[PDB]
Amino acid sequence: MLTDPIADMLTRIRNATRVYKESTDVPASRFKEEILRILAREGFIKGYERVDVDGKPYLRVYLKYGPRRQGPDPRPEQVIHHIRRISKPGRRVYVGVKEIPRVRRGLGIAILSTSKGVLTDREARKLGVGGELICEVW
């Protein structure tokens, strides 16, 4: 069985960008959606759509990359340098609003789930709520 589906998605993305795929298919959930919603809004992907694949629902995910570079290795800078699952099954991680961390001095974000819905670090502190802390992304 797939134990942590959220972790799988983050990996699935990490894995796709390193070989510079155009887009990648991740099995769909209302939850994985509310993450991409953020991932998209904060400029890390071009966006996502709800393609069906042999009848079963996925989420195509259009990845972004930097400009073509020069010298040896022209491959572009990634837009997602780094993406890490933080609360994992059987080591769940919750933060209070006071404990919400500053990722990359704020050149990066930290998606987290709250009883006010899924938000970024800035989103949550402005809103004065903590919650389960899903992942880092910078």
Binding site: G90, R91, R92, V93
Partner: protein
């Protein structure tokens, strides 16, 4: 506020007393992970009324014997022996764990 626990009766084999099993989940001091953990309370049952299986509310009371300090407040839901069986098998393991074998 006199403390109030909620639990499962796992024993009816006493005169006017019922062993209640109270489970409590808290996260671990250093390792963060949530761990379930539990304790058995002897509760006063003045009318041998509560039967093995149900889920009761337990309440902090003036002492009634050595290690018997709670009275059985109200009843939550009726029967469910699954909880007892869980608690039963757990016990049965001990039959092994000695010098020979036993029941797995």
């Amino acid at each position: 506020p006199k403390k109030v626990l909620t639990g499962v009766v796992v024993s009816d084999k006493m005169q006017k007393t019922v062993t209640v099993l109270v489970e409590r989940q808290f996260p671990h001091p250093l390792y963060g992970k949530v761990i379930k953990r539990s304790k058995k309370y002897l509760a006063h049952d003045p009318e041998e009324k509560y039967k093995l299986g149900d889920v009761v509310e337990i309440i902090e009371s003036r002492p009634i014997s050595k290690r018997k300090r709670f009275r059985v407040l109200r009843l939550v839901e009726s029967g469910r022996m699954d909880l007892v069986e869980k608690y039963l098998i757990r016990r049965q393991n001990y039959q092994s764990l000695s010098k020979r074998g036993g029941k797995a």
